[PDB]
Amino acid sequence: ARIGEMKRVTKETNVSVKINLDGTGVADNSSGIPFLDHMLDQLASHGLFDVHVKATGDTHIDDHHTNEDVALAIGTALLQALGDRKGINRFGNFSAPLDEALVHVSLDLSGRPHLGYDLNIPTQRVGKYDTQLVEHFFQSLVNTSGMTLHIRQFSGTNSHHIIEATFKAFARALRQATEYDTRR
Amino acid sequence: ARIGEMKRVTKETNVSVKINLDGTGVADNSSGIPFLDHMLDQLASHGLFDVHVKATGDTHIDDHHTNEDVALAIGTALLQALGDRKGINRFGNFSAPLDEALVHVSLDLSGRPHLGYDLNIPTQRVGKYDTQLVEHFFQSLVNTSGMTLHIRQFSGTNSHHIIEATFKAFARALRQATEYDTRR
Amino acid sequence: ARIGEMKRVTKETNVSVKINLDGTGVADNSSGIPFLDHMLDQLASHGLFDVHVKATGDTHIDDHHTNEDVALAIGTALLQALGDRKGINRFGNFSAPLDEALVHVSLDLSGRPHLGYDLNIPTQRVGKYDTQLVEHFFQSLVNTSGMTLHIRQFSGTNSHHIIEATFKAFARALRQATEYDTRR
Amino acid sequence: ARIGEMKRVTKETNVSVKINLDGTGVADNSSGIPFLDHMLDQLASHGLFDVHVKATGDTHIDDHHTNEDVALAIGTALLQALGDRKGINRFGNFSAPLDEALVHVSLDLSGRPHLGYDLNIPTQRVGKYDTQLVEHFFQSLVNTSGMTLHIRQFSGTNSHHIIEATFKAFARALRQATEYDTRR
Amino acid sequence: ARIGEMKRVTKETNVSVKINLDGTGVADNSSGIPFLDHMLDQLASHGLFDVHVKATGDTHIDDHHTNEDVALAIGTALLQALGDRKGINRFGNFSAPLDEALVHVSLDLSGRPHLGYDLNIPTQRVGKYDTQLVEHFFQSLVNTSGMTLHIRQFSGTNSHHIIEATFKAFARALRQATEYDTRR
Amino acid sequence: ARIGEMKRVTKETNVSVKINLDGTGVADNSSGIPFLDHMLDQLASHGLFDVHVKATGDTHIDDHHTNEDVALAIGTALLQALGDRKGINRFGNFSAPLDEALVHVSLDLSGRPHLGYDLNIPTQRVGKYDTQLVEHFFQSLVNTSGMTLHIRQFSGTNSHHIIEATFKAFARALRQATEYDTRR
Ligand SMILES: O=P(O)(O)OC[C@H](O)[C@@H](O)c1cnc[nH]1
Ligand SMILES: O=P(O)(O)OC[C@H](O)[C@@H](O)c1cnc[nH]1
Ligand SMILES: O=P(O)(O)OC[C@H](O)[C@@H](O)c1cnc[nH]1
Ligand SMILES: O=P(O)(O)OC[C@H](O)[C@@H](O)c1cnc[nH]1
Ligand SMILES: O=P(O)(O)OC[C@H](O)[C@@H](O)c1cnc[nH]1
Ligand SMILES: O=P(O)(O)OC[C@H](O)[C@@H](O)c1cnc[nH]1
Ligand SMILES: [Mn+2]
Ligand SMILES: [Mn+2]
Ligand SMILES: [Mn+2]
Ligand SMILES: [Mn+2]
Ligand SMILES: [Mn+2]
Ligand SMILES: [Mn+2]
Ligand SMILES: [Mn+2]
Ligand SMILES: [Mn+2]
Ligand SMILES: [Mn+2]
Ligand SMILES: [Mn+2]
Ligand SMILES: [Mn+2]
Ligand SMILES: [Mn+2]
């Protein structure tokens, strides 16, 4: 089983993260940000990873520094879990709906970081969560993990539906790229 | 008296609902969402139904899952109260103002679900309540009850006035369609 | 083997339907509408289902009531064949060409009905079949089965080619979503 | 193992080609055109075919006649390797990135030739290779093999990145369509 | 060492301020406004001033009166610390980035107050802090200190990044203008 | 003296690089690309670094793979030379002309990679060198070194003048950011 780990402490935040790439979908996510915990459960449920996050930070300023440090920690742990990368599929591709929304995702585990982001989120807040932090989460994840990632919206109107469909399609495309390629 | 009931429990919410179609306007509505309780009182007061709702949920994420599960429960209870549908008017139609706002409603108790929605709500929050949830409430209600519904705005500026006039006109059109047609 | 059945008789039509989700591609389709029989054979041939339809109706008015009642019967039989839905893939996705035409399909077996339809069919009749009935067929199927469905055109000019490519891509995406997920 | 062969000699060129559809990714490509050799290596590496090309021609006029005759020879050898086409998947579909570029490919091994081409290459030369020859290569390949092919660009800026991503996505979609379908 | 002081009490607020122009970067900032404390720490860290603020006010109306009175107090203390202004550089100029944002600042310690402000902040709230108060802060500071100030945005998208880059560039330009000019 | 080193060998290229941050302007640059050697001499001459590059590659395809691998090696060696980064200026800023051209540069040695690129180069080739490789050079350098970089054109017409003025302004801004800050 490919298991990666990371711990990071600064003057703003304290973060611990653990990821299993050959899991059964166990989730235990307790950051300081309740809506982000709901999205990280989708990564376990539709990708079948084991995911565990614990974090405390400076949320009386805002949620920005806690959102950034958690995303950096997940990228580092994924790069440690993958290792040599011998014998994997390496590419993944999927489109996923939630009622009237639909999002398309493709990625490549290349060693070269890049983000292409093309979403149109029509409100500024979902509950207490700020909607500019969705794009900042994915940009910090690709910088520490070294992946090429493209995200593109086909339709949708409700803001809760659009974000949750992104995290569903991302989970299924990442599951495809990390599985072993039994050859032709 | 035509009385319908429903109870639904999931990992997000716990909901109980009871509706009387031949009532005197008794209201007892205690969801977790205070502005939605104020709108459900209009359904009892202007339609003369008896309406009772009790709900608890996961409102520290947001109000979305609690708003959706309550609406599904009301649609199921209405379909159980109606039964065979022998001898009713079946169609209803009404327009209702509140100061400078005016909304037109027509519906048909057909067995075929459809929503046509045409409102223009100019702010994002009324009190703590999110304004995209008005359209999600009516879409969940027509899917479990099987009704054809059309809603169209003629004028209006204040957001509180526009939503409360929708729930007034809906109540008077539903009262017309469920009453017995003493024949010509 | 997951097998679903339905019989419906009204003052307009008489319909019998049977579907096997673990089939070998046996087709026996005899509605009153010859072009619709040719499309239902594609569902058996490219999805590997067993499909059987028998229908008579009031085709001297037009084909509308017979087209609607057959589609409702197929949705009910699919919902009975699926049952609990334990252990399936649940999502499906595919794009299919026929000469110069190309159509993209994605779906989710959710319990929440919705149709997104985006085709541009350039003539009014193919043989004797009316081209507005393509959209009415898919809307009746999602209302009884409870599925989320999105259909989108990428290119194409000939009307026979565009409709037949829709039914090919739909068959391959439905085969993906009903198969058992041997886990990671 | 399905192996196809072809030899063609005219007053312009001399060409020999050999392809294995059940290979391990062995490449030995020596045409007179160095950039085209680099693209043919991608077909072996990402599709897992065995590919061997040897060619000499009249490259002091230009590269046009050598580029056309090699493409015709590959189409003939693929049609000989496939034979009866009993029991294959027959359809294939994939999207592939390279940094900021992304291209979508779908195809069908039908017996009816057609090309849909939609790329936007922003310079006239990559090294010594002329960029109008990319479209001429794919048009000659579909005429001798008899396949339906669609190619469409989603993003990209660098000319080397756009062409190499086309040959990657084409390789993965062709691998899907030639594999045996173990039935449902 | 050039040290300036100020105390101001009204029926709205109570404010105490102390600034050292020849400091080592010691910060002790406790206003009633948490996001403004985070920006005042940047003034100590990148300009190497010693800065100390203590304030209480009427924040149950809003943050406006507390934001205005703190800014007036800082301008007065800077004018007392500078004194005669013999032998200083008097002018300062700097451009500073933070990820995708970039802001240009130039100023002159002239005795004539003026503000030129050209920022485009795309949301209304960062955490609890209102974004119209950024411009009101700088206008009150130049009126009591008597400085000419110009602020201009070159790029940027995230609201937290744009404001924090303004306070970084302002700190480095003010450090340049208050240092002693060892002559040519 | 802060000295960094790197050696990288792949199936495309062979590269060796050495950089001194406290140098006297000694240059010894022998890649396979003659115009790129002329630009690397500007980095020694105007920034006062010592720079040494040796490379061989696959330039009969094109110059792309050799241009990319050299840029990656320089970024790694700079990150090794900097180390802890205690006591440096960390920011740099400069604008530089060459006849009718003028380019503005600012950067920050942050640990977070980002490139903003805004040039308009009016021809496709300068000598034998391809002009799309200027942007690819700077993107590979910021990914291995972890710097924030912004480049913006103010005027210019001749292609040789525009590129050489970029490399002059970059050299003077990097010299500023790596020097020791004798404190205030
Ligand atoms: O079981 P699902 O994966 O379909 O989860 C849907 C839930 O009800 C909830 O996550 C949701 C419903 N609408 C937005 N979010
Ligand atoms: O008695 P009414 O039905 O007219 O209720 C009006 C109330 O004052 C209140 O519901 C309201 C007034 N304006 C918006 N809402
Ligand atoms: O064998 P296929 O699946 O390619 O069927 C094609 C048939 O010839 C026919 O269905 C058709 C050809 N053009 C439109 N329809
Ligand atoms: O190993 P890869 O498949 O990612 O090959 C990338 C190579 O470095 C090279 O083919 C390339 C890099 N950029 C354009 N071409
Ligand atoms: O050390 P820095 O000056 O780069 O501070 C950056 C911090 O992480 C934080 O202030 C920040 C990061 N993004 C916005 N704010
Ligand atoms: O001495 P300089 O730095 O001005 O170098 C100018 C040279 O003549 C040469 O590099 C040049 C002149 N025009 C373009 N390049
Ligand atoms: Mn940030
Ligand atoms: Mn949800
Ligand atoms: Mn919902
Ligand atoms: Mn009211
Ligand atoms: Mn109808
Ligand atoms: Mn046909
Ligand atoms: Mn030709
Ligand atoms: Mn290449
Ligand atoms: Mn004021
Ligand atoms: Mn910050
Ligand atoms: Mn490259
Ligand atoms: Mn020169």
Author numbering:
A (entry chain L), B (entry chain E), C (entry chain O), D (entry chain A), E (entry chain K), F (entry chain W): 78 to 261
Direct quotes from the study:
The crystal structures cover the MtHISN5 sequence starting from Gly77 or Ala78 through Arg260/261 (chain and structure-dependent). The cryoEM MtHISN5-IG2 complex structure reveals detailed information about the most likely substrate positioning before catalysis. The imidazole ring is trapped between manganese ions, facing its Nδ towards Mn2 and Nϵ towards Mn1. While the formation of the active site with the bi-Mn2+ cluster requires a contribution of residues from two subunits, a third subunit participates in substrate/product binding by contributing guanidines of Arg167** and Arg189** that bind the phosphate group. However, based on our complex with IG2, these polar H-bonds are rather weak, with the donor-acceptor distances of 3.5 – 3.8 Å. In fact, we expected the reaction product, IAP as the enzyme was incubated with cIGP (at 2 mM concentration) for 2 days prior to the cryoEM grid preparation. We clearly recognized IG2 based on EM maps (inset). Interestingly, with 2 mM cIGP, the initial lag reached the maximum time that the PEAQ-ITC apparatus offers (170 min). This peculiar behavior can likely be attributed to the contamination of cIGP with IG2, as revealed by our cryoEM experiments.
Plant HISN5 catalyzes the sixth step of the HBP, in which imidazole-glycerol phosphate (IGP) is dehydrated to form imidazole-acetol phosphate (IAP). The MtHISN5 subunit contains a four α-helix bundle sandwiched between two β-sheets whose four strands are almost perpendicular to each other. The dimensions of the MtHISN5 oligomer did not change significantly after the binding of IG2, indicating a lack of major conformational rearrangements.
